[PDB]
Structure formats: C-alpha cells, structure tokens
Subunit: 101 residues, 12 copies
C-alpha cells in the first residue's frame, strides 16, 4: 500500500515509502501553512552497471488546517519508508446547532 | 431532483431531502466559516419488521464566502425535505477595470 | 434505497418514497386485478421563488396474483414515504410431484 | 494552443485568445485577491448576414497568492489575443528543514 | 465556432480564424479550379520569452464548382479572422424531370 | 519502476522492491532449476496503531536456463529493495546455419 | 418512421409499411385474444434480373386487452403501407381511490 | 450446450443437466398452470475432503399455455441430465384471416 | 434492405424505397453529369389524426462516369419503391499493360 | 462450477463434468509426462428426434511435475462427472536459503 | 511497412508488396486518367499439399492529377515487391496571391 | 495470411514471409532443442531515396518436442517467403487407458 495520511488520536500523520532512497536525498520545506517534500534520485553516486535503474518524481504538497507549528514537527526514514508526525490544532471553540422548528 | 444550492436575490440557500428522516435525526454544526450537516438513520426506533430499510450517509460540508453570521441562520424540515436559509455578505466595496490601451 | 416490494409473512407490501409530495397529490386506482398509483407535482400551490423545483413522473403499475380484494387494502404516507399493504391470496390447494422413475 | 498561465522570472502572467473579440467587449474586475475576466459577444453591432456567427462564454476566475496589487497591473489585446501581466509577491521570508535524525 | 463555408444569396464564402496571425503570414494560391490557403507561424519575429507559443498547420484545400474566376475574388483579415468572398457560377441552363408514368 | 530481470554482461540478475519489508521477513528456496522467493508481512510485530497497514503477496517463481549453480548465488536487501545475482551458464558449444541454396 | 401503435379516440390502431409487398403476400391470423401478421417475400414471381432483391421477416405479434372482437376488424394496404383498425373495449365499470387518511 | 426447451411434434419438452446431482436432490412442483423445479446441493452427505465442491442454484420457472395436465407428465434423470416431457394442448379451434380489400 | 446501386450487364441502376410516398411527392433533376433526387413529405394532404406521422429527408446525389445521356433515362415507383435505370457509357477504347521486365 | 485441479494432501487431482457423456465416449492417453483426455459426442447412437442436441470439444492437456507414474493412476465417471486421481512426486530433497548478510 | 505513395523530386511513385506473387499473376490497366492494379492468386499451379495457403484481394485504384501519360510509365516486381514509376505533370503556369489590404 | 506452423503427415513445418528480405539477411540458430530465426533489415545496401522504407523485428523462437535432429533440417526462401521443414519424432512407444470401473 502506497501511503497513509490521517488525523490520529492527537496529531496529524503522513507516511509514504520509496525504494533505494536513503537518508541522503530527502528534503522538506515549510511555509506559513504549506509543507512540501522533495525527494530525488541520487542513484548516480555508486555506479550504474545496470538497466533497471529507478528514477521518478517524489516531491509533493501539503496544507495544514492551522499554520504549521514548526518546533515539534518530527519525521523519520527507515527501510525506504518516510513518515512525518506533526501537531494537531485547537479547532472548535464555539458552535451553534439546528433551530429547524 | 436531489438538491438546490444558490445565492437568491438577497441571501444564500440550500435545500435537500431525505425519505423517512423526521425532525429527530437532524443536526448541524457551525465553525468560523464552515457549516456541516449530520443526518443519520433512526430507522431503528419503531421496529424493523421489514426488508427494504433505508440506511445511508447524510452529513455534508459547506463553506460560506464570509464567516457565517450565526444569529439569523434559519432552517426547516417538512415532508422529508431540509432547507437552510443564511444571510448573504457585503462584498464589492472597491474594484478596478481594464486599461488595455 | 428507492423501494421495496415483497410478500411478507402473511400479505403483499409495497413501499416507495417521494420528496415534497404531501397527503394531497396522492391517488391510486384499482381494477379487476390491476393496481395503479398516480402521484403528481402540486409544487405550484405555495410559490416558486426558486430554481431547483422538482418535477417528475410517479404513477406506476401493479398486478396481484389473484384479483385484488378491495376492502382491507390499506396504505399510508409519512415523511415523504408511501406504502401499501394488501391481502395475500390462498394459492396451493393441490399439487403433484416427480415420478422420474 | 488555447492559453498560458505561469510565474515568469519576476511576475505572474496569463494569456488567452478569442476570435472576433476586439478592444470593445473586454472587461475585468478585481477583488481583495480575486481577478475575474468578462468577455462577451458584441457580434451583433455590424450585421449578421451570416450563419456561422460565433457566440460563447469568456469570463473566467483567478486568485493570486497574495492580495492583488492593483496599480502596476497591465494587460493588452491584439489580433484576438488577450494577456495580463501582474506583479509577483514576496513569499519565503523564513523556513525550516528536516531533522529526520 | 471554428469556420463557416457556404453559398450565400449570390456568391461563395469561406471564413476561418487564427489567433496571433496578423496581416503578414497569410498567403493563398489559385489553380484552374483549386484554391489553397497557406498560413504559417511568424511567432518568431518579436521574441519568445514565453512557454505557450502557439504553432500549428493552417494551409487548406478548396475546389470551386466552376473554374475560379480570378479578378473579383476578395478576402480580408481582422482580429485574427480570415474570410474569402468569391463569385458564384451560372449553373442550371437546362433540366429534365420525372416521367414515372 | 517495479522490477528488472535481465542477463547482464556476465550473469543473470533480478531486482525488485518492497516498502516496510526489512531483513527479517525475507526467504528464498532453490530446486533442481527452480528459484522461488517468499516475502511476507511482519507488519504485526511493532504495533498497528494505524489504518493504512500494507499487506500483500510477495513470493514469486523463477527458472534458470541451466540447473541453478548454488554456491556463488548472492542477494541483498537495502532501502526496501531486493536483488539477486546468479551465475550465467555456458550455452552455445555447437551450432549449424542456413543451407537455403 | 417505421410504425405507429396506439389507442385512438375510440379504437386501437396499428400501422406499418413494407416496400415491394403488394396486396398478395399479406396474411393475418386471429386467436382468442392474439393477433399475428404474416407478410413474406413474393419477390420471386416476376424475375430476379437483379442484385438488391429485398428479403426479410415481417410477421409479428399482438395482444388485445379484451378478447379481439372479430367482425368489425378492418385493415388495408396502400403504397407499401399496411394498417389495421380494431374496436376498443369497455373497461372501467368500477373503481376505488385513496383513503390515505 | 446447457438446455433445450421446445414443442416437439406432439408435446412440450424441457431438458437440462447438472453435474453431481443424482436421483436424490431433485424435486418439482406444479400449480394451476405453473411448473417449478427445485434442485439443490446434497454435496455434503459423502464427505468434503475437497476444494472444488460445486454449489449453485437450480430451481427455475415454467408456464404452460393451457393449465398443466398432471397425470401423463413424465420426467427422468440420467448421467446428470434431467428432462421433462409434458402433454401438448388443443389450441386453434377457430380462426379468421385478412380482409384487406 | 435499404438500397441497391450497381452496373448491371448493360447499364447503371439505382433502387431505393420509401413508405407512404406515392407518385406525387417524387422529383428528380439532372445536370451536365449530376443526378439528384428530391422526395419530400406530402403526408399533410389527407389528414393527420395520428401520432406516428413519418417525416424525413429523401433527396440524394449521384454522378455518372460520362455525362448523363438524357433521353432513354427511365424510372418508376411501385409499392413505395423507387428505381432508376440509366444508360451505360462506352469506356475502354485503348489500354496499355505492364512492361515490368 | 466447471472444474477443480489441485494438489491434495497427498496426491494430484483433477475433476470436470459433462452432461450426456456416459461411460462410453471417454478416453485418455498418457506420455512420458503428458496426460491428455479425449471425450467426444456419442449423442448419435440413440436417436436425434430433437433440436438442442449438445456437441462440443472435450479433450484437454495436462503435464505432471515428474513423469507420470502409471500403475496407481485412477479415475471415475458418475452423474456426468469425471475425476482423475494420480500420485504425487517426491520433490525437495535439498535446498539452500538466503545469505543476504 | 505496407506501401508508399508519393510525389518524388520529379515524378509520382507507388510501391507495395505481396508474398508468393511472382512475375505471372500481375496485371494493370490504364484509362483516360485512372490506373488500376489487378494481382490475384496463382497459388494453385504448383500444388496445395498445405494448410496456410494465402489468398486475398490485390487490385486497387489510382487517379493521376493530369491524364496519365502512357509511354514512359515503368514498373517492376522483385522479392514479392511491386513498384510503379510514372511521370509528373506540369501544373502551376499561373497564380494570384492575397490582397487582404 | 501471416504464417503456418503444423505437424504435417510425417514431419514438422513452419512457414512465414517477409517483403524485401532476400537470400542475404536470413540466419537461423539451433540449440539442444531450441530453434531461433534471425532476419534483419539490409534495406540500407542499395540506396534509400525513399520514405516508406520498411524496418521491423523478425527473429523468433521455437522448441521441438524431441531434441532437434540437425542433419536433414531443410528450409528455403522464395518471393519473400521463408519455410522450414524438420523431422518429426518417434513418440508413443507405450500407453495405458481408463480403468474407471
């Protein structure tokens, strides 16, 4: 299965995966509320000696409900699998319901 | 015809419809600018004694141009038909046009 | 789910549904063994002031196995939902089975 | 090719095209951050004397990243071709990167 | 609408259209009875500085019923719209009808 | 790109890839000339706490031209990527060509 | 248009059509309530001397609501067009309507 | 070929077929004019010890032109093949033909 | 079958067909080498009193190899079937064959 | 369900089925390792007197992993159902596993 | 690739191909301006002793711009490949261009 | 028709075909039991002077039941048609049949 993206019990979480890609070719970037991921192909630093070299596009968008709180943002890569944990927001301070009468 | 959603001559109006659903299983919820509707199936409180019991999903999104003014928001249900009337906003205080020269 | 039509434990039952349609625009008609339903659009008696006025065709056929016994035929409309209960018949007074030898 | 829409080396640019439409039937309109274009068919002011008169819908949306700065907004029409040049914004004053550890 | 081609009340008329193309890149050619149009892309004489440069094929055939009378043949280009007016012929000097008996 | 399978300049090589799968859930098996791969889902040994858990089938066939020489067979897993290197055979000791005359 | 079949103001009427078929190759047949038409190809009695001889199937079913009254049944063929006029029945001697309460 | 259903030279005949089904799991049932067949799966009385156990639905409808004469109705099963022979009726005591004039 | 168009053993022949159309609404027209047929709908001269009135387009083109010799051109309509017989031409006065060497 | 083909707990088993076909029209044939089945249509030895006579092709291939041991091969036909039981082989006398290091 | 048909630097050229067909079964025919090719199947003069005998249709049309000059027309067949070289014409003695003003 | 491949009355035979390809660009190759054909495009040795030059892939596999006996293998090319005749094998020295009891 390619990816997961969901509000967990307390936060927001993404998870994707990529063969070959090690701890080197990974980058991200933040904005006022926009996250972006940039993975690329460093499958040119050992040797080719091959045919089925894999090359594709990896960077991708994201927007958080509230402006992305930056400090506690965590992420990790293992066995060709990246995943990013990020804090939830504090929505629902006020609401009103039906008066259908 | 399932629904209508439109800016009338003075306000914003939604209208949808649902068999069975009476004045009980209806709920809404507001946000800073987000409306959401939650209807569900209380077709379990009289008796089944049936085969063609109808059950589906009814809640749905909405966003208003300007933050939803809450007081005068009205809505009503009759003959299995929901409809919500909500105040318009006061856009277009300034504009500029072509200077194609 | 649109409709149900079935032999229950003791009788025959139809059930359908229609938004808007109240206790006024409903009619039926019987025959020697043919039932027919005629619903129509009285969505012209309050006001239009609208775009998504719903108008369609509602009348529909039926035939009962035995000629429709007329007295105890019942029906009802609620929350835009029609349903007709009608007596079963007394088939299977005699039968013969295989003699495949 | 119908249109182009892109961030150039320094600004934002749209370009589209329309047969017949001259410097008369063109209009635009601005908002806090919303641009809209309104072209229409003045192919009724010379004469018809024709069959293949062209009539369609031309107005279209746009939103700029930052609220549309209004003064230096330029545009032009030639040979049935419209194009609008508009100032870029000043995003990316701060950023944070991975700490995948 | 792309083009029109028709016998008018007195003559024959074509009309087509092309963004960008001005009074320069247009050419035609005549034959004993064959007309041909050759438009091309001079969208290389101002500057590119662009992505959505439009380039396509424009030349096209035609045959007139009678050999094309050459003198009074007229044509014009405006707002990226070409159109050619050409004299009709003098067919139907004799006819015979049914004798189905 | 999913996989590569090819005769290299001197040997035979397979390469595939699998997210999540680490150095644990991997197995192979040999035969007289048949290779088979068995990967499975050990995504049950850390915790679920998730929705998009990935589970599928991974084992797959192979046959080598000549009976698989077993000693020098190598393979490796990194960044969720498996690949197996295996010795080539020594075909083409004799041949005959056309005599089409 | 191939055919017409309808209850007129007072009776029941069919109309169809067939090239070539003259007053010879036409037949019908009645039943307790079933009508059937049998037209065939007598395009073998003058001469072939041809390629595009037309041959197809023409007979077709019908059932009348009440058993077909036989005497006044009329029909006619002209210009390769058949049409059958037949008496209506006397349905609706009794009816009952809604009691939806 | 699955089945045959036809009026023979003197009667009416059905024939179908079913693997496994022996002389046990077969049943029929008659009505005023309705025949029905009920075969089922007794592939649970010897043992499973298997994977490709076959289970499906076998009962099926029939209506005879005239009310089914019951005595001489015959049927048989052999080599997983059922077939039912039933008496024809005595239709066509009277008829009327065209008067197309 | 709709139509036939063919060179017979000695001439050229067309044949088509049209329900309703009698000996009245038929017309043709000749040219230097162009034949055209014009049938239309006179299904307005008796009465409508109907629903399935048939109306369509019937005129159609033709070109003969050599200019249409006019005198001996024959045609006829019967049972809603038109057919036109026309003289062949006298092609093939000279020819040359391969010299492939 | 048409057929089953599988390695059971101890052997190899096929099972298929055929209406009509009795113990007569069945044949098989063996090879070094190839099995083939030949059923045909002896539905010509009793009488036709029918329309829905069934005729098709029944012979089919098979290959066993190891050369087919011939003695204990069993098979049977009942209720139009064929099935062949055949001995398994003795594979897996030696194996080697990963050394992914 | 099946065929080529093109105006070369000085003439007109066709080229096609056909297995089996030798220098015998080839024919052409000329007209005032129409060329036609007739190849056929003489794959009946040696012996069949075969299954995959090839038989198809080979004759085909052509029209030249100007009436086909007959003398210098050349053609040849080799290795199951035919090709015809034919003289070009002398078009474009006069022309007129745009006056779009 | 592209090819034929079949066991004749005494041997095995292939036949295919290729335009242009003469007695030069043809090659085959044998193995223990594998035949392979290699045709290629020598349509570069006379001249191009063309557009519709044909180039494709021609080599193809084959396996014989028994190891290919090499001496008497024959083949030939004529009129762009290849065909290979090869000796049959001597299968069926022993067999066993049903004992369905």
């Amino acid at each position: 299965a390619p990816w997961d993206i969901k509000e967990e019990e307390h936060e927001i979480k993404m998870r994707f995966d990529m063969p070959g890609l090690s701890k080197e070719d990974v980058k991200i970037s933040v904005e006022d509320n926009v996250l972006v991921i940039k993975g690329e192909q460093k499958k040119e630093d050992s040797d080719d000696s091959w045919s089925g070299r894999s090359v594709s596009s990896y960077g991708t968008r994201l927007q958080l409900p509230d402006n992305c709180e930056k400090d506690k943002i965590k992420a990790e890569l293992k066995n060709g699998v990246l995943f990013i944990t990020i804090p939830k927001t504090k929505v629902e301070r006020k609401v009103i319901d039906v008066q259908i009468q």
